[PDB]
Design an enzyme around this catalytic site. Structure first.
Site, PDB file in Angstrom:
ATOM      1  N   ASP F  43       0.832  -1.191   0.000  1.00 10.46           N
ATOM      2  CA  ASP F  43       0.000   0.000   0.000  1.00 10.46           C
ATOM      3  C   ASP F  43       0.875   1.252   0.000  1.00 10.46           C
ATOM      4  O   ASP F  43       2.106   1.184  -0.051  1.00 10.46           O
ATOM      5  CB  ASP F  43      -0.952  -0.011   1.195  1.00 10.46           C
TER       6      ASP F  43
HETATM    7  C1  LIG Z   1       3.647   4.774  20.031  1.00 12.86           C
HETATM    8  C2  LIG Z   1       2.365   4.848  19.190  1.00 12.86           C
HETATM    9  C3  LIG Z   1       1.506   6.117  19.399  1.00 12.86           C
HETATM   10  C4  LIG Z   1       0.204   6.186  18.550  1.00 12.86           C
HETATM   11  C5  LIG Z   1       0.317   6.956  17.197  1.00 12.86           C
HETATM   12  C6  LIG Z   1      -0.657   8.156  16.988  1.00 12.86           C
HETATM   13  C7  LIG Z   1      -1.929   7.879  16.136  1.00 12.86           C
HETATM   14  C8  LIG Z   1      -2.319   8.948  15.062  1.00 12.86           C
HETATM   15  C9  LIG Z   1      -3.284   8.468  13.930  1.00 12.86           C
HETATM   16  C10 LIG Z   1      -4.032   9.598  13.165  1.00 12.86           C
HETATM   17  C11 LIG Z   1      -4.467   9.292  11.706  1.00 12.86           C
HETATM   18  C12 LIG Z   1      -4.644  10.535  10.826  1.00 12.86           C
HETATM   19  O1  LIG Z   1      -4.515  11.639  11.285  1.00 12.86           O
HETATM   20  S1  LIG Z   1      -5.058  10.335   9.031  1.00 12.86           S
HETATM   21  C13 LIG Z   1      -6.515   9.208   8.725  1.00 12.86           C
HETATM   22  C14 LIG Z   1      -6.353   8.334   7.462  1.00 12.86           C
HETATM   23  N1  LIG Z   1      -6.937   8.903   6.237  1.00 12.86           N
HETATM   24  C15 LIG Z   1      -7.748   8.185   5.361  1.00 12.86           C
HETATM   25  O2  LIG Z   1      -7.985   7.015   5.625  1.00 12.86           O
HETATM   26  C16 LIG Z   1      -8.311   8.843   4.119  1.00 12.86           C
HETATM   27  C17 LIG Z   1      -8.463   7.912   2.890  1.00 12.86           C
HETATM   28  N2  LIG Z   1      -7.824   6.608   3.092  1.00 12.86           N
HETATM   29  C18 LIG Z   1      -6.558   6.307   2.560  1.00 12.86           C
HETATM   30  O3  LIG Z   1      -6.022   7.201   1.917  1.00 12.86           O
HETATM   31  C19 LIG Z   1      -5.891   4.917   2.778  1.00 12.86           C
HETATM   32  O4  LIG Z   1      -6.771   4.279   3.640  1.00 12.86           O
HETATM   33  C20 LIG Z   1      -4.475   4.973   3.444  1.00 12.86           C
HETATM   34  C21 LIG Z   1      -4.131   3.626   4.058  1.00 12.86           C
HETATM   35  C22 LIG Z   1      -4.486   6.053   4.515  1.00 12.86           C
HETATM   36  C23 LIG Z   1      -3.346   5.314   2.348  1.00 12.86           C
HETATM   37  O5  LIG Z   1      -3.509   4.519   1.298  1.00 12.86           O
HETATM   38  P1  LIG Z   1      -2.480   4.646  -0.224  1.00 12.86           P
HETATM   39  O6  LIG Z   1      -1.133   4.183   0.279  1.00 12.86           O
HETATM   40  O7  LIG Z   1      -3.203   3.694  -1.147  1.00 12.86           O
HETATM   41  O8  LIG Z   1      -2.631   6.116  -0.509  1.00 12.86           O
END
Ligand SMILES: CCCCCCCCCCCC(=O)SCCNC(=O)CCNC(=O)[C@H](O)C(C)(C)COP(=O)(O)O
Ligand code: SF4
Ligand code: SF4
Lengths: 208, 115, 176, 112, 379, 88
Positions: F43
């Protein structure tokens, strides 16, 4: 009206109505409504686009010069399509007066930050972001101010539960404070207090 | 119609670019966070946790929701880097004191009435 | 009207400048403060000899809760649940049923003393003076459990403190 | 001349009549670029003309302070500067235009 | 440029310093956030009253008055004159308590601990007044949205008069310890200077305005209850620093003594709560003799009184500054929304600007001069 | 020599080696022309991690906009060479 009833003040009512009409006349682009309450409080309902102009006007106009920002907060009304209403309370020392400015937004639409107009807004908007999840655009540094670090959700929303979703304790196995789903030894007792037989006929709504 | 005001991104592509930037920042930060907080987890499982948290929101198709999530994740990274969080806050992502909840029908039927 | 707190101009004549220089070099105001402290050393202290002496209190003072009864010995509480309804902390839990002789009495009356804010709203909401906040304040405990009062504990508190409670009520009831 | 207006950070203004005249003239110049029918232009022109006429007809400072009803001519100058800045920003904003859009049907209905 | 996190009233302070200079001061709050405003939505107005005692703990009586004024305005009723006079008298007593606490603590942090004890004896006497009028020393819940809960006992005015005629000597002793001391002046003079324009824009209120020369006081400009029937002066600073604010606070205590004297001499007769049994509960004897009184007692203590729908912003001149409530009623007996405005919130938000280019030890003085109580700030 | 001369062969060996170190691609299935998404099944986040591995192996910074289009080891090598301007 006898001694138990709050006395009225028609002079302040007339003055506030006239100034509300004046403000609405000067900025028809943004002012949606003007109201004066029966206890002489003036509120101006505006479009969200006019937060920076209107406030600036109310701060800088020679006839208004509301130079103090008393409070800035939000109210959550889930039944409205635009969920949150943003309330600014302003004080003018030159004319010894107070004004309220109201606007609206939903979960995803940002509101322009007003730190350029009033420095006092800096923390207030932060608190709103913490408690209601309303994003303010061009804020110098927007982050949580009241909740614990890593807290999920916005507690002041109506649908947020009173006791939340997690609670904290000390675990000896991992030797630290941990968070677990809430479990109350005694559940909060919900009271149904609202009576039938409406109290105030002057606020009755049409039966549609 | 259905015209709405943007937050940061006009379409999904800019949103994914922001998501990738935030993911890079978190991936870079993980080893320093592990060392600074004296965590007993490994860097590998910390990065796995970051990946899992990102994948939890993989179904979002609204750019406004996406960059609001990006804003929240950036706030979380800001809290982590500046050591405003304590060890307990970082370790809350792992739920080490919670007994596992079985998912199959029979176990849920045995433990109680909760689906 | 308004007042200026710091709108005095120092005099610039030689005598005043010399007075200020003498204050600067000989430390006059510091000696004045030393004199104030010395004067305070020689006056009687305000300390009382607890627990042999106690701080003053009022009949209106609210202490540990108690359930009172009538002179005949029957309890005053008739399980109306007004105290439970008004309790700002939800610290009161009440369960009631008809008694063996048909009387309206409680079977459960619990006060969580670690949730109570000791506001006294219960004793003023009570229509029959059944629940009161008695004068005792020295009821600290070694465990959390002993602060979860049931009906037996509250009735025992009432039987223990009734004399003082009734005297306080007699003193203060014409104000209520 | 007095000293220490009494507000921290507000300097005593020597020769305030010239400063007020310049500020009011600049305000009128800026207001001249706003459309003639805009309420802000007419209202601010009326207020500024009243103030300019009152400063032009009163050479004494304290009498001017009493007539202006702002007091402490330094903060009158400050309010004139604020009005000039607001006038420029309002010429940029153009708030005399019709309303951007109405709120939803029951946006402001209270209760519920 | 070194960064220090002075952690745990209870305050976390993250600073960046360049040498001895304070380059940046960032306060982290929420260590006393209890969610008061959300909890209020699950209570009746009477049930919500005791939270205001706990908001600003140092001056409990004033918060009660602000909340009661907001509820009274929404109810379209007014309290009886004797209740108003009692409210103002106990508000001025409350001001003295807050001022003693603010001044002694500021001095104690500065390293002068003697006046803390000297004036906490007087604080104990005023706690005795509180307890005699309400039964509680500090969390009183005495001032209600219909007036006051109970009338004064038959000997309280004389004891208040006896206390108040000796307090000026205590203030004089405090000044002898502080005002002309060169160490105190060096610790306070020219520290945390704020201009009038900056104070107005940053949302400051109370002494934080009046130390910069701004002539503003809510008891004079927007009087509530009977403050228009008493005579007093508003102390005004000239340099906007800690020393001028200390002088203003000391002067304010003297003025409060003056107002207390006037309140004592002009206390009127009559009832203590509004003669309206649908708002204020009836007397016990009436409740036990009259059907209507019993019904109204039952309903007022189970459902509570309904407040007509509407929103108000009510502010009073609190000891720490302007203290306000934005109250939204939906027509029921429980408030829809209660936003609490605390002066200390804006003052702490301005701490960053106030401490620019100062020593680390000046931050303590600036925090002391801002008069910060954490419960009100976090709510 | 302080720095050895860098050739396309050395760059390729380094690139395929750091791909071999990546635990989601087994050594026997990857190649110089193997596409990341389809031949290896990865991915966008896997590609982003690979780009960071490239950055910390070659000691320089790859902007996101042009890092998003490197879909093969071959075009990764082309990008590295173009940024470094190698001869062979
Ligand atoms: C020690 C650990 C501490 C914890 C960590 C902190 C957690 C923070 C998490 C916050 C997440 C966000 O802000 S961002 C939220 C994610 N965004 C989306 O899901 C929008 C559309 N989806 C996609 O683009 C694909 O699912 C994707 C797999 C993302 C890319 O795939 P490609 O490759 O096909 O592009
Ligand atoms: S004193 Fe107040 S908090 Fe305590 S039980 Fe009675 S009503 Fe409840
Ligand atoms: S204690 Fe009093 S108020 Fe409470 S249930 Fe018994 S009778 Fe009713």
């Amino acid at each position: 009206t006898r001694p138990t009833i709050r006395p009225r003040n028609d002079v302040v009512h007339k003055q506030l109505s006239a100034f509300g009409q004046y403000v609405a006349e000067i900025l028809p682009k943004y002012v949606q409504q003007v109201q004066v309450s029966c206890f002489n409080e003036l509120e101006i309902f505006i479009h969200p686009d006019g937060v920076i102009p209107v406030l600036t006007f109310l701060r800088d106009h020679t006839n208004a010069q509301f130079k103090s920002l008393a409070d800035l907060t939000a109210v959550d009304v889930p039944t409205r399509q635009n969920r949150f209403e943003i309330v600014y309370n302003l004080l003018s020392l030159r004319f010894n007066s107070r004004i309220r400015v109201k606007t609206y937004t939903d979960e995803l639409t940002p509101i322009e930050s007003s730190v350029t107009v009033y420095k006092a807004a800096n923390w207030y908007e932060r608190e709103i972001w913490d408690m209601f999840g309303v994003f303010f655009a061009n804020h110098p540094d927007l982050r949580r101010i009241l909740t614990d670090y890593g807290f999920e959700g916005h507690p002041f929303r109506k649908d947020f539960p009173l006791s939340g979703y997690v609670e904290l304790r000390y675990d000896d196995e991992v030797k630290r404070v941990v968070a677990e789903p809430v479990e109350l030894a005694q559940e909060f007792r919900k009271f149904d207090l609202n009576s039938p037989w409406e109290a105030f006929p002057a606020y009755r709504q049409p039966p549609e | 119609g259905t015209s709405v005001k943007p937050i940061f991104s006009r379409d999904m592509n800019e949103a994914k670019r922001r998501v990738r930037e935030l993911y890079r920042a978190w991936y870079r930060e993980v080893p320093n966070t592990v060392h600074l907080f004296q965590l007993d987890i490994s860097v590998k499982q910390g990065r796995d946790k970051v990946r899992e948290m990102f994948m939890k929101n993989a179904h979002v198709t609204d750019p406004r929701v996406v960059d609001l999530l990006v804003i929240k994740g950036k706030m979380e990274l800001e809290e982590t880097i500046n050591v405003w969080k304590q060890r307990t806050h970082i370790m809350r992502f792992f739920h080490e004191t919670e007994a596992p909840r079985p998912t199959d029908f029979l176990s849920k039927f045995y433990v109680g009435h909760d689906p | 009207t308004y007042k200026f707190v710091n709108m005095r101009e120092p005099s610039m004549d030689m005598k005043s400048v010399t007075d200020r220089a003498a204050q600067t070099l000989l430390w006059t105001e510091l000696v004045r403060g030393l004199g104030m402290t010395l004067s305070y050393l020689f006056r009687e202290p305000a300390t009382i000899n607890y627990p042999f002496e106690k701080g003053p209190l009022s009949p209106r003072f609210r202490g540990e809760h108690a359930l009172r009864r009538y002179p005949s010995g029957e309890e005053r509480c008739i399980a109306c649940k007004l105290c439970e309804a008004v309790c700002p902390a939800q610290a009161i839990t009440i369960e009631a049923e008809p008694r063996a002789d048909g009387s309206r009495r409680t079977t459960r009356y619990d006060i969580d003393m670690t949730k109570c804010i000791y506001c006294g709203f219960c004793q003023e909401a009570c229509p029959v003076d059944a629940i009161v906040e008695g004068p005792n304040f020295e009821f600290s405990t070694e465990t959390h459990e002993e602060l979860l009062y049931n009906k037996e504990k509250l009735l025992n508190n009432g039987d223990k403190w009734e004399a003082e409670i009734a005297a306080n009520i007699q003193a203060d009831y014409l104000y209520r | 001349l007095k000293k220490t207006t009494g507000l921290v950070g507000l300097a005593v203004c020597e020769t305030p009549h010239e400063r007020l005249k310049i500020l009011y003239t600049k305000i009128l110049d800026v207001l001249g670029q706003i459309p003639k029918n805009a309420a802000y232009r007419k209202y601010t022109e009326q207020i500024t003309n009243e103030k300019l006429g009152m400063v032009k007809a009163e050479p004494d400072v304290k009498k001017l302070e009493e007539q202006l009803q702002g007091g402490q001519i330094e903060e009158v100058i400050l309010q004139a500067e604020n009005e000039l800045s607001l006038a420029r920003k309002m010429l940029r904003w153009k708030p005399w235009e019709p309303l951007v859009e109405e709120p939803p049907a029951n946006q402001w209905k209270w209760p519920i | 440029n070194l960064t220090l996190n002075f952690g745990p009233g209870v305050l976390r302070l993250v600073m960046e310093l360049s040498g001895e200079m304070v380059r940046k001061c960032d306060p982290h709050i929420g260590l006393l956030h209890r969610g008061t405003e959300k909890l209020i939505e699950y209570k009746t107005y009477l049930q919500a009253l005791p939270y205001f005692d706990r908001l600003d703990y140092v001056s409990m009586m004033c918060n009660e008055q602000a909340y009661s004024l907001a509820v009274e305005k929404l109810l379209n009723i007014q309290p009886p004159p004797r209740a108003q006079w009692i409210r103002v008298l106990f508000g001025e007593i409350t001001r003295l308590l807050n001022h003693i606490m603010a001044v002694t603590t500021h001095a104690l942090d500065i390293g002068a601990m003697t006046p803390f004890f000297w004036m906490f004896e007087e604080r104990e006497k005023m706690f005795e007044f509180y307890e005699r009028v309400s039964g509680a020393r500090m969390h009183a819940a005495y001032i209600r949205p219909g007036g006051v809960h109970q009338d004064l006992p038959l000997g309280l005015l004389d004891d208040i008069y006896e206390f108040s005629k000796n307090f000026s000597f205590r203030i004089d002793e405090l000044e002898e310890m502080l005002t002309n001391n060169r160490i105190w002046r060096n610790r306070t003079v020219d520290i945390g200077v704020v201009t009038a324009e900056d104070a107005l824009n940053y949302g400051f209120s109370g002494v934080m305005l009046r130390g910069s020369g701004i002539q503003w006081d809510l008891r004079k400009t927007q009087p509530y209850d009977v403050y228009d029937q008493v005579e007093f002066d508003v102390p005004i600073g000239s340099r906007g620093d800690c020393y001028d604010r200390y002088l203003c606070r000391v002067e304010e205590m003297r003025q409060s003594l003056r107002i207390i004297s006037q309140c004592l001499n002009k206390m009127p007769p009559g009832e203590i709560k509004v003669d309206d049994a649908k708002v204020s509960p009836p007397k016990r004897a009436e409740m036990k003799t009259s059907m209507e009184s019993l019904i109204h007692h039952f309903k007022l203590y189970t459902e509570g009184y309904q407040v007509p729908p509407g929103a108000t912003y009510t502010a009073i001149e609190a000891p720490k500054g302007e203290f306000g409530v934005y109250l939204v009623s939906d027509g029921s007996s429980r408030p829809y929304r209660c936003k609490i405005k605390a002066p200390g919130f804006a003052h702490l938000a301005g701490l960053d600007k106030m401490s620019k280019g100062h020593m680390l030890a000046d931050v303590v003085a600036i925090i002391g001069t801002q008069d910060i109580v954490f419960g009100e700030v976090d709510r | 020599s302080d720095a050895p001369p860098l050739t396309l062969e050395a760059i390729k060996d380094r690139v395929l080696y750091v791909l071999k170190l990546y635990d989601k691609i087994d050594p026997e299935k990857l190649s110089v022309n193997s596409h990341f998404m389809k031949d290896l099944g990865l991915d966008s986040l896997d590609q982003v991690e690979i780009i960071m591995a490239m950055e910390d192996e070659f000691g320089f910074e790859i902007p996101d906009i042009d890092a998003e289009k490197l879909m093969c080891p071959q075009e990764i090598v082309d990008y590295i060479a173009d940024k470094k301007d190698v001869y062979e």
